[PDB]
Amino acid sequence: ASKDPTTFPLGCSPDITTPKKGLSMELYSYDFRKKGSYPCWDAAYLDPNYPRTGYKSHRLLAKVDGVTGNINFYYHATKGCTPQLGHLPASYNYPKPLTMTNFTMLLYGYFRPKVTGFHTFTISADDLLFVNFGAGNAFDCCRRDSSADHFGNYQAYAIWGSKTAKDELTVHLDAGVYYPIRLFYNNRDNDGALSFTFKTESNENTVSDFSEYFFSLDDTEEGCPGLI
Ligand SMILES: OC[C@H]1O[C@@H](O[C@@H]2[C@@H](O)[C@@H](O)O[C@H](CO)[C@H]2O)[C@H](O)[C@@H](O)[C@H]1O
Ligand SMILES: [Ca+2]
Structure with a gap:
């Protein structure tokens, strides 16, 4: 598993144990700066090591399993520079x-395609969504705990305030193979939004519901490298 982003990512072949539905999620706090700061929000989220080590210094809120379905959301704040409560979707x-x-x-786990061929994932975010995809690039097959912090350059990324807060990733995938995936999200202030969808060459359907696509696999002693 090379760490570099590629159009032909490497996947994984789990053994006997049934993959579990959904991704794992970890939620962390992200404070504003002190009252009166200009701007009110902290730019820590754009430190190059924030998605790797920096986030870990912040308060851990939760770690959950079973994240699946439609993971898209749009949270409307009533104003900026103000911590406001809300809820993530039931997914x-x-x-x-x-x-x-x-x-x-942070979300991580595996993406299992239903079709063999080119997939184009489209992402957008307010404020930030960084995507790694493929063995090595995201993490190693059934060896996530050992490789989790060694992800490579992003396959796709979106940052609000850029020319487009939108990006795409086009990758050729094999049906029924399990591809490591890592999604890293931040909201710095005010509204928050995440959109993650894909299309394939097989038809013109857009997938937004990942119920049959996102899975979790236990790490194993020997890992589970792609056998196809
Ligand atoms: O529009 C979403 C965007 O809002 C940002 O807050 C903005 C701020 O950048 C500036 O334009 O002022 C307005 C109102 O005073 C405020 O909406 C926020 O920092 C970003 O993260 C986005 O959510
Ligand atoms: Ca925002």
């Missing part, structure tokens, strides 16, 4: 309020 399996104006979220 996130987290039924507590959080400061939806200002938080960090």
Whole structure:
């Protein structure tokens, strides 16, 4: 598993144990700066090591399993520079309020395609969504705990305030293979939004519901490298 982003990512072949539905999620706090700061929001989220080590210094809010379905959301704040409560969609399996104006979220697991061929994932975010995809690039097959912090350059990323807060990733995938995926999200202030969808060459359907696509696999002693 090379770490570089590629159009032909490497996947994984789990053994006997049934993959579990959904991704894992970790939620962390992301404070504003002190009252009166200009701007009110902290730019820590754009430190190059924020998605790797920096987020870990912040308060851990939750770690949940089973995140699947439609993971898209749009949180409307009533004003900026203010921590405001909200809720993630039911898909996130987290039924507590959080400061939806200002938080960090990590999702990881595997993407299992239904078709063999080119997939184009489209992402957008307010404020930030960084995507790694493929063995090595995201993490190693059934060896996530050992490789989790060694993800490579992003396959796709979106940052609000850029020319477009939108990006795409086009990758050729094999049906029924399990591809490591890592989604890293932040809201710095005010509204928050995440959109993650895809299309394939097989038809003109847009997938927004990942119920049959996102899975979690236990790490194993020997890992589970792609056998196809
Ligand atoms: O529009 C979403 C965007 O809002 C940002 O807050 C903005 C701020 O950048 C500036 O334009 O002022 C307005 C109102 O005073 C405020 O909406 C926020 O920092 C971003 O993260 C986005 O949510
Ligand atoms: Ca925002």
